[PDB]
Write a protein that binds this ligand. Structure first.
Ligand SMILES: [Mg+2]
Ligand SMILES: [Mg+2]
Ligand SMILES: [Mg+2]
Ligand SMILES: [Mg+2]
Ligand SMILES: [Mg+2]
Ligand SMILES: [Mg+2]
Ligand SMILES: [Mg+2]
Ligand SMILES: [Mg+2]
Ligand SMILES: [Mg+2]
Ligand SMILES: [Mg+2]
Ligand SMILES: [Mg+2]
Ligand SMILES: [Mg+2]
Ligand SMILES: [Mg+2]
Ligand SMILES: [Mg+2]
Ligand SMILES: [Mg+2]
Ligand SMILES: [Mg+2]
Ligand SMILES: [Mg+2]
Ligand SMILES: [Mg+2]
Ligand SMILES: [Mg+2]
Ligand SMILES: [Mg+2]
Ligand SMILES: [Mg+2]
Ligand SMILES: [Mg+2]
Ligand SMILES: [Mg+2]
Ligand SMILES: [Mg+2]
Ligand SMILES: [Mg+2]
Ligand SMILES: [Mg+2]
Ligand SMILES: [Mg+2]
Ligand SMILES: [Mg+2]
Ligand SMILES: [Mg+2]
Ligand SMILES: [Mg+2]
Ligand SMILES: [Mg+2]
Ligand SMILES: [Mg+2]
Ligand SMILES: [Mg+2]
Ligand SMILES: [Mg+2]
Ligand SMILES: [Mg+2]
Ligand SMILES: [Mg+2]
Ligand SMILES: [Mg+2]
Ligand SMILES: [Mg+2]
Ligand SMILES: [Mg+2]
Ligand SMILES: [Mg+2]
Ligand SMILES: [Mg+2]
Ligand SMILES: [Mg+2]
Ligand SMILES: [Mg+2]
Ligand SMILES: [Mg+2]
Ligand SMILES: [Mg+2]
Ligand SMILES: [Mg+2]
Lengths: 134, 147, 362
RNA sequence: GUGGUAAAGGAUGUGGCGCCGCGAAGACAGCCAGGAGGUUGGCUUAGAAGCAGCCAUCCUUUAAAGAGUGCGUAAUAGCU
């Protein structure tokens, strides 16, 4: 990674671009609620998913953490947080597609994609793939 | 007109064996007059060759057994071809040997004198099917025909 | 080769009668249901029952190979006698299986090892030998087909080596070098003596595998206990109503550190932890080396009363004292000819020693 | 006694809309009978019998019974 430094917080107004549709994969996981999802949170779900169907299909990750996470070491007011303590996060607004699974049966996608939902700070939903494309 | 007690399935070499486990446990903790018991076994394997014969044993009320000898299991017949003594670790990616849907037939005829299956045509898929989920495929030519 | 054959037969033979009767006690044991209704019991039952796999095949296979050969072997330079000879060539790779089953049974035989040579009684001459054994064991490794990584070397005063250490890279490097510990006696006219008389000298040798670490795993919270409390001394009203004293006790060992230097409980807890670490680390570090002090216990004799195998260059003859075995080519021995020696003598003795001890009074 | 002021997450609380499939050629439940054969699927494992872990997709008696749902034995049978 590269970018530059520390970045302002900014708000999470309506989930406008906050969202998408299922790109790849048989199923996916969508955010019902806005939040900053941490790096750790992400990997938590990932490794969970794999661990569930050992030697399994393919897990996609449509979201990606690039916002620097500032934080102060238990002090007061000089300068801006050395930050980066949780490290980095991804801006997930209601609608966004976060993980795609493919190459597995429903009962596997449902379960795994659900277990992942337990690691995420948010209310979520698992989608088939209707057909709505473009 | 025959008192039985408990069925006990064992696989073994035909005309060759001893108490040795897991055979020891079975007829050991349930008794054995293997004097006259293994005397009917040697004649039931006198002119009979070696294999993995599944003799469907069945203890009697006198604590004996029904030693009905049967045709050695499908895995046995298949490795009679490839010259092995096992089966594939993972029936799918690996494939230890590749046989003929021809050889299956005459060895399957050896299996019908005990099997229930009516025709040898249905006994083609069974032996092929066993070879399927055991790490070995085949080749054929006639099959269906039809219009 | 008729000699090493009967030898391998003799090894397998004493196994026969012992495991012969040992099997019969165990087999009629595995017959009863009452025996199996004791799960952990019939586990170790089926374990010894299992050992009868390696017992049977050796005796059976080897017994038939002795007799068949003996017959069609005695006399003929052309026909059926050379027909029977390469039938025992496969039986020679079956001798192979036998040997592998006698060595591989060490704790860490399979992995590379670490040899160390340290001179002893004999002075400047004693260390001259240390270097002779250095090259000796080194040279053997090349032929065994192994990579030698010299970890440390230190030339002495006159002759060159007060100490040395090596890393025999390969497999079974330990199991092979294992029976080479202890002292080594060396007699000869001394190349340093102005009179040249015979002088005994002694070098030391040791050998060991390799392993891992444990540090941070201990800092795991549920193990230690952290107390807070008011500080002591200066602070005024601050020190009074502000508890900044911290004490982390490491419950698993009871060892504890306490700190109340700064005014911050957080900066004090931070420090105590960072010191408990280092203390706890040394304790666990010692325990590691304390296990290697019980490996010094495995064998750690003095320096020249005791020996293991003599090498006299006068009358030309080496002599492993552990086995009574002999030889008359110390030159060859001091070069690599060890396989045959180590193999039988060393493995045999070492294994049979500890083995008969374990199955008879251990 | 929600109202009279808490969250992930949970559950045959209750009401309302919607789509899917089953049923008078008899459904759902309960209840009587089988519930099988090569098979003991192949591979590992001391052992691995639908039934630890690994790989996987046969046919036969039939109106019917999965190379198998869960318990259970050391492994069975078992009951389902
Ligand atoms: Mg946060
Ligand atoms: Mg202040
Ligand atoms: Mg697909
Ligand atoms: Mg699908
Ligand atoms: Mg959650
Ligand atoms: Mg949640
Ligand atoms: Mg949900
Ligand atoms: Mg669209
Ligand atoms: Mg008779
Ligand atoms: Mg009886
Ligand atoms: Mg022989
Ligand atoms: Mg003869
Ligand atoms: Mg010749
Ligand atoms: Mg030959
Ligand atoms: Mg040997
Ligand atoms: Mg190095
Ligand atoms: Mg000096
Ligand atoms: Mg020097
Ligand atoms: Mg001089
Ligand atoms: Mg001198
Ligand atoms: Mg001179
Ligand atoms: Mg912990
Ligand atoms: Mg004071
Ligand atoms: Mg003062
Ligand atoms: Mg003051
Ligand atoms: Mg205060
Ligand atoms: Mg206070
Ligand atoms: Mg102080
Ligand atoms: Mg200070
Ligand atoms: Mg301790
Ligand atoms: Mg001394
Ligand atoms: Mg030479
Ligand atoms: Mg209230
Ligand atoms: Mg809720
Ligand atoms: Mg709910
Ligand atoms: Mg419901
Ligand atoms: Mg009907
Ligand atoms: Mg059944
Ligand atoms: Mg079986
Ligand atoms: Mg098996
Ligand atoms: Mg059964
Ligand atoms: Mg079981
Ligand atoms: Mg097909
Ligand atoms: Mg019972
Ligand atoms: Mg068993
Ligand atoms: Mg059953």
């Amino acid at each position: 990674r590269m970018k530059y430094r520390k970045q302002q917080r900014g708000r999470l107004k309506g989930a406008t671009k906050g969202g998408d549709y299922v790109a790849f994969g048989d199923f996916g996981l969508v955010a019902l609620e806005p939040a900053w999802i941490t790096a750790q949170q992400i990997e938590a779900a990932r490794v969970a998913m794999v661990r569930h169907f050992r030697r399994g299909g393919k897990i996609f990750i449509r979201i990606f953490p690039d916002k620097p996470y500032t934080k102060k070491p238990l002090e007061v007011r000089m300068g801006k947080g050395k930050g980066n303590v949780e490290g980095y996060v991804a801006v997930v607004k209601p609608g966004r597609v976060m993980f795609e699974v493919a190459g597995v049966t429903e009962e596997q996608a449902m379960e795994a994609l659900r277990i992942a939902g337990h690691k995420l700070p948010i209310k979520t939903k698992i989608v088939r793939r209707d057909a709505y494309d473009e | 007109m025959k008192k039985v007690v408990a069925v006990v399935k064992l696989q073994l070499p035909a005309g060759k064996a001893t108490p040795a486990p897991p055979v020891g446990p079975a007829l050991g903790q349930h008794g054995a007059n293997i004097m006259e018991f293994v005397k009917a076994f040697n004649a039931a394997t006198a002119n009979m060759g070696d294999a993995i014969v599944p003799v469907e044993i069945t203890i009697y009320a006198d604590r004996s057994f029904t030693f009905v000898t049967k045709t050695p299991p499908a895995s046995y017949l298949i490795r009679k071809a490839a010259g092995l003594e096992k089966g594939a670790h993972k029936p799918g990616r690996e494939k230890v040997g590749r046989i003929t849907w021809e050889q299956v037939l005459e060895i399957a005829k050896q299996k019908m004198p005990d099997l229930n299956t009516t025709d040898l045509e249905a006994a083609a898929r069974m032996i092929a099917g066993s070879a399927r989920s055991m790490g070995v495929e085949v080749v054929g030519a006639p099959e269906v025909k039809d219009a | 080769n008729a000699s090493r054959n009967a030898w391998k037969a003799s090894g397998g033979i004493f196994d026969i009668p012992q495991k012969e009767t040992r099997l019969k006690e165990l087999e009629r044991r595995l017959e009863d249901p009452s025996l199996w209704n004791d799960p952990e019991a019939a586990r170790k039952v089926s374990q010894e029952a299992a050992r009868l796999r390696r017992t049977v095949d050796t005796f059976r296979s080897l017994e038939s190979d002795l007799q068949g050969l003996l017959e069609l072997m005695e006399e003929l330079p052309a026909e059926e006698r050379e027909a029977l000879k390469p039938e025992l060539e496969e039986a020679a790779k079956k001798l192979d299986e036998l040997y592998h089953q006698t060595l591989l049974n060490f704790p860490h035989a399979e992995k590379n090892a670490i040899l160390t040579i340290q001179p002893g009684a004999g002075g400047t001459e004693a260390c001259d030998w240390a270097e002779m054994l250095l090259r000796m064991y080194t040279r053997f490794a090349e032929r065994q087909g192994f990579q030698v990584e010299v970890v440390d070397l230190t030339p002495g005063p006159e002759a060159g080596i007060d100490y040395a250490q090596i890393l025999v890279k390969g497999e079974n490097a330990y199991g092979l070098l294992s029976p080479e510990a202890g002292v080594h006696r060396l007699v000869r006219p001394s190349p340093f003596d102005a009179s040249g008389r015979r002088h005994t000298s002694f070098a030391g040798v040791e050998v060991i595998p390799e392993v891992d670490e444990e540090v941070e795993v201990v800092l795991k919270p549920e193990e230690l206990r952290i107390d807070v409390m008011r500080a002591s001394g200066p602070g005024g009203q601050g020190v009074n109503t502000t508890d900044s004293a911290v004490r982390v006790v490491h419950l698993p060992t009871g060892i504890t550190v306490t700190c109340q230097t700064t005014r911050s409980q957080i900066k004090n807890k931070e420090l105590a932890l960072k010191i408990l670490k280092a203390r706890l680390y040394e304790l666990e570090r010692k325990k590691r080396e304390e296990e290697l002090k019980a490996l010094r216990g495995e064998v750690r004799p003095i320096e020249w009363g005791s020996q293991i195998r003599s090498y006299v260059l006068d009358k030309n003859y080496v002599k492993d004292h552990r086995t009574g075995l002999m030889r008359h080519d110390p030159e060859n021995v001091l070069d690599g000819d060890l396989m045959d020696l180590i193999w039988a003598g060393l493995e045999w003795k070492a294994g049979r020693r500890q083995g008969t001890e374990e199955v008879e009074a251990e």
